[PDB]
Design a protein around this ligand. Sequence first.
Ligand SMILES: *CC(=O)c1ccccc1
Length: 229
Amino acid sequence: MIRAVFFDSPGTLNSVEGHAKMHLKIMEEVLGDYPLNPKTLLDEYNKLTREAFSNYAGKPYRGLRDILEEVMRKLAEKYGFKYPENFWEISLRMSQRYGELYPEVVEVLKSLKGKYHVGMITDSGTEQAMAFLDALGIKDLFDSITTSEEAGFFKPHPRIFELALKKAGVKGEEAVYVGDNPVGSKNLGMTSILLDRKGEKREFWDKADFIVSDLREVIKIVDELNGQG
Ligand SMILES: *CC(=O)c1ccccc1
């Protein structure tokens, strides 16, 4: 039976509303008075980060800060502005100010806790993951927190899922994974629930076992899988 529910963090938990304008403001802070359109810088940054994230999926862990600093070094060299030595801190300030959970998250996590193992699985480094959970006040809502840094590899490499299952003491067939962007979990027998809040991730629909738009649907799926629907 299903004894554990794992959440893809931060994707299933943290709102992305307004993030494009937040990232535009980061680029404005990088540039200052430099005569480059911040939207042009943002678009080029997003191209390079897309490339990097595609490259690193399934590969050994590398720190995000190192990756993003490399991207910014390349862009500063390309466009002629001074490399922002504090780019990471500029970005972190933005994420601290505007981090915000989706409105149903806390009650869903509390509804599952104690009845099922409630786990978090993330590609974030461990320090970043813990700081995220603490900033949003939900660290104690998880029974396990499993990172790419601990496993050694980024999703969708199976090691991170194997480690999460071992921490919980459950088999894959006893677990659900709620995912935001599953390029993985099913290699280990886990049941996959894709969270698609806007009904826009059709490239992931067909491999998912279930698709939901709101995490309150997760409870109802787990109940059904356990014969209590
Ligand atoms: C990217 C960005 O500005 C952000 C990310 C997470 C939380 C808040 C803001």
